[PDB]
């Protein structure tokens, strides 16, 4: 309930991704309450807060991975697959343990939803 | 399995020269429970044509399956070496005299001796060296024929096809009209047969069918190349398996150039006619009867099974073409199978092939399926719109992350 009024009070508009979306998704994932985060996941983010610095790619990967896991938990595969795809295709020059165990889950969700592993962009 | 209907004596007598032995070799390869007797008959009938290495190979094979005049064969080898040395001396003399015809004849004789001995690399090198000596178009055609036949013995079909095409297109497309309806020397028929054999061995059945029907009967029989009976068999099977109804009617049924070939083999003629006349029980029965004999061929056996499947498949789509709902008991009786096997084959065809139908297995009836165009277009358009919206949202997010310079290092 705190990192829910701390998100819409600090971001510009509803379509602006801030570094607290990842924390909200992680908190509502650790305690199995997937309903509070739905209003913050159904929105298609189209701008990203610079946050006066900081905001590495870790927050981006965390948001687009935990949201996919939340959507998988509610059996919304059509959007969990999209979230995992957004997590994988982040520009990268090294290996992180959020782009690996998101490709691995993307394969499984693609097999469950479709009949085949969808080709990455 | 085993078939005595094939007359090995007549089949060997159809061909002449070295090639016969090669064919008999396949008879040794495909002869369960009769390989030894067939090989003994082949040795008894075709002991001629100066077999040396293959003779010893076959003798050892039959000895190990179920001493000789080694002095005479060693003396024959020594005499062959002396003849080869004399031929080399004559070739050197011709080179000193600088006569193109003399050196060409010497190279041809050396290649012939290599053929009857078994040498292929030296013969190939000799042919490659002699290829660089061309003066007139007749000599070009002659050396093309020589290299084509030795490559057929060498079994490199891509080169044969390429050089046949080049030699066909070189002389202003076969002299335009064709020198007053072809020449007495039917070289064009030989080129067509060689191209057909190459394309058949290169897994292109339709091209072999198309170019093997243009061979004429005036060529009689070329022992080095295919005999007329084999030409008819190949051009019938490939045409049946590849040509549709209009093509089969125009190029095989009604053409007055292939019927003379079909007179040699009446079974293939009956099979083609019964396929055309929608009589499939008899056609398939004759095909299955002749499959066992065809399996003993040399250039067609590896392609038999596939071809057969193709042919059978055609009949299926040709059976259901006029019908909007067909009883499967009559279909199974027509194709000489049970209803369950027919159902499995029909499902395999419906899943991917040309049959657009649905099986009602409560009453065993195959119903023709008519697609609805309006609903299909609506579904596809809505799916395309959904995919486009997803892609656009993803690209907007990608633009945002690229603009903000977000990456992992």
Give the DSSP letter string of B246-313: HHHIIIIIS-TTTHHHHHH-HHHHHHHHHHHTT-HHHHHHHHHHHHHHHTT-SSSGGGHHHHHHHHHH
B357-360 and B365-368 strand pairing = antiparallel
Which pair of structure tokens corresponds to residue B356?
Answer: 């657009």
Selecting from A57, A82, A89 the residue whose C-beta is nearest the C-beta of B408 gives A57
Query: Which chain B residues have a beta carbon less than 8 Å from that of A89?
Result: 398
* Best of B395, B396, B401 to mutate (most A CBs within 10 Å, chain A): B401
Closest CA to B108 of B126, B92, B121, B95: B126
Q: How far apart are CA B325 and CA B358, in angstroms?
A: 10
Q: How far apart are CA B32 and CA B9, in angstroms?
A: 19
Reported as type and span, the H/E element at residue A63 is helix A57-73
- Residue B383 dihedral angles phi and psi, to the nearest 5°: -60, -45
Selecting from B390, B401, B407 the residue whose C-beta is nearest the C-beta of A48 gives B401
> Alpha carbon of A60 to those of A34, A47, A57, B52: distances in Å?
19, 12, 5, 79
Selecting from A48, A94, A99 the residue whose C-beta is nearest the C-beta of B406 gives A48
| HSE-up (13 A, CA, CB side) for residue B85 | 6
Q: How far apart are CA A10 and CA A117, in angstroms?
A: 38
| 3-class DSSP assignment, residue B368 | strand
Within 10 angstroms of residue B330's Cβ, the number of other Cβ atoms is: 10
Which of A106-116 are b and which e, b meaning 16 or more Cβ less than 10 Å from the residue's Cβ? beebbeeeeee
Instruction: Name every residue in A having a CB less than 8 A away from some CB of B.
Output: 17, 44-48, 50, 55-58, 60-61, 82, 85-86, 89-94, 96, 99, 121
Helix%, strand%, coil% for chain B, nearest 5: 70, 5, 25
Measured in angstroms, the CA of B390 and the nearest CA of chain A are apart by 9
Question: Which residues, in sequence order, are CB contacts of B387 under 8 Å at separation 6+?
Answer: none
> Alpha carbon of A28 to those of A34, A72, B26: distances in Å?
6, 14, 75
Q: Residue B389's closest chain A neighbor by CA?
A: A44
Which of B145-178 are b and which e, b meaning 16 or more Cβ less than 10 Å from the residue's Cβ? bbbbbbbbebeebeebbebbeebeeeeeebeeee
Way the structure was solved: cryo-EM
Instruction: Name every residue in B having a CB less than 8 A away from some CB of A.
Output: 390, 393-394, 396-398, 400-402, 404, 406-409
Reported as type and span, the H/E element at residue B326 is strand B325-327
Q: How far apart are CA A77 and CA A94, in angstroms?
A: 28
Determine the straight-line distance between the first and last CA of chain B, rounded to whole angstroms: 68
Selecting from A60, A86, A93 the residue whose C-beta is nearest the C-beta of B409 gives A93
Count of residues making up chain B: 409
Query: Which chain B residues have a beta carbon less than 8 Å from that of A86?
Result: 394, 397
Query: Which chain A residues have a beta carbon less than 8 Å from that of B408?
Result: 56-58, 61, 90-94, 96, 99
Which pair of structure tokens corresponds to residue B242?
Answer: 């590849």
B325-327 and B365-368 strand pairing = antiparallel
Q: How far apart are CA B316 and CA B348, in angstroms?
A: 12
Q: How far apart are CA B144 and CA B128, in angstroms?
A: 11
Rounded to 10°, the helix B228-242/B187-201 angle is 50
> Alpha carbon of B296 to those of B30, B184, B243, B338, B341: distances in Å?
6, 34, 25, 29, 28
Closest CA to B272 of B222, B209, B199: B209
| 3-class DSSP assignment, residue B119 | coil
Q: How far apart are CA B146 and CA B20, in angstroms?
A: 18
Do residues B164 and B148 touch, judged by C-beta distance below 8 A? yes
Which of B215-230 are b and which e, b meaning 16 or more Cβ less than 10 Å from the residue's Cβ? bebebeebebbbbbbb
Q: How far apart are CA B104 and CA B88, in angstroms?
A: 12
Do residues B52 and B74 touch, judged by C-beta distance below 8 A? no
Query: Which chain B residues have a beta carbon less than 8 Å from that of A55?
Result: 404, 406
- Residue B370 dihedral angles phi and psi, to the nearest 5°: -105, 120
Q: Which residue has the tokens 């390429």?
A: B162
H and E: helices and strands count for chain A:
6, 2
Do residues B26 and B297 touch, judged by C-beta distance below 8 A? yes
Which pair of structure tokens corresponds to residue B131?
Answer: 């290829």
Closest CA to B237 of B316, B338, B135, B310: B310
Q: What angle do CA A33, A39, A45 make, to 5 degrees?
A: 120
A16-17 and A47-48 strand pairing = parallel
Query: Which chain A residues have a beta carbon less than 8 Å from that of B393?
Result: 44
Cross-chain Cβ contact A61/B408 below 8 Å: yes
Q: How far apart are CA B392 and CA B390, in angstroms?
A: 5
Do residues B355 and B346 touch, judged by C-beta distance below 8 A? yes
Strand partners, A47: A16
Q: Which residue has the tokens 């015809």?
A: B101
- Residue B50 dihedral angles phi and psi, to the nearest 5°: 55, 65
Chain-centroid distance of CA B227 in Å reads 13
């Amino acid at each position: 309930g705190i990192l829910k009024q701390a998100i819409d009070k600090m971001q510009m508009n509803t379509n602006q991704l801030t570094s607290i979306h990842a924390d909200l998704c992680q908190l509502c994932l650790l305690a199995k309450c997937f309903k509070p985060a739905l209003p913050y996941l159904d929105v298609d983010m189209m701008d990203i807060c610079k946050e006066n610095g900081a905001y590495d790619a870790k927050h981006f990967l965390c948001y687009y991975y935990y949201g996919g896991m939340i959507y998988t938990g509610l059996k919304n595969f059509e959007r969990a697959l999209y979230f995992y795809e957004q997590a994988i295709t982040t520009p990268a020059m090294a290996v992180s343990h959020i782009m690996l165990e998101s490709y691995k889950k993307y394969i499984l969700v693609s097999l469950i939803l479709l009949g085949k592993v969808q080709q990455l962009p | 399995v085993e078939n005595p209907s094939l007359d090995l004596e007549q089949y060997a007598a159809s061909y002449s020269g070295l090639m016969r032995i090669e064919r008999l070799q396949f008879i040794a390869d495909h002869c369960p429970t009769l390989r030894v007797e067939a090989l003994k008959m082949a040795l008894s009938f075709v002991q001629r044509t100066f077999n040396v290495d293959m003779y010893e190979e076959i003798h050892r094979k039959l000895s190990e399956a179920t001493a000789l005049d080694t002095a005479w064969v060693e003396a024959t080898r020594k005499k062959a070496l002396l003849k080869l040395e004399k031929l080399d001396t004559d070739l050197k003399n011709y080179k000193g005299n600088s006569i193109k015809e003399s050196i060409r004849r010497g190279h041809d004789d050396l290649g012939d001796h290599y053929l009857d001995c078994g040498d292929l690399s030296n013969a190939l090198k000799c042919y490659s060296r002699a290829r660089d000596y061309c003066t007139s178009a007749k000599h070009v055609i002659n050396m093309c024929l020589n290299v084509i036949k030795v490559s057929v013995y060498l079994q490199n079909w891509s080169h044969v096809l390429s050089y046949v095409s080049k030699a066909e297109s070189t002389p202003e497309i076969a002299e335009q009209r064709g020198e007053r309806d072809s020449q007495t020397q039917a070289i064009l028929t030989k080129l067509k047969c060689a191209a057909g054999l190459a394309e058949l061995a290169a897994r292109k059945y339709k091209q072999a069918a198309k170019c093997l029907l243009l061979a004429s009967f005036d060529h009689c029989d070329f022992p080095e190349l295919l005999s007329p009976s084999n030409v008819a068999i190949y051009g019938g099977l490939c045409a049946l398996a590849t040509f549709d109804r209009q093509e089969l009617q125009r190029n095989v049924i009604s053409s007055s150039s292939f019927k003379l070939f079909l007179e040699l083999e009446p079974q293939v003629r009956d099979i083609i006619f019964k396929f055309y006349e929608s009589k499939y029980a008899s056609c398939l029965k004759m095909l299955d009867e002749m499959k066992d004999n065809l399996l003993l061929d040399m250039y067609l056996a590896p392609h038999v099974r596939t071809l057969y499947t193709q042919i059978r498949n055609r009949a299926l789509i040709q059976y259901f073409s006029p019908y909007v709902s067909a009883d499967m008991h009559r279909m199974a009786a027509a194709f000489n199978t049970t209803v369950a096997a027919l159902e499995d084959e029909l499902t395999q065809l419906i899943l991917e092939g040309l049959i657009s139908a649905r099986v009602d297995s409560h009453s065993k009836i195959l119903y023709a399926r008519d697609v609805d165009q309006r609903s299909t277009t609506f579904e596809k358009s809505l799916l395309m719109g959904k995919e486009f919206q997803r892609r656009a949202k993803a690209m907007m997010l990608r633009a945002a992350v690229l603009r903000n310079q977000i990456h992992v290092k």
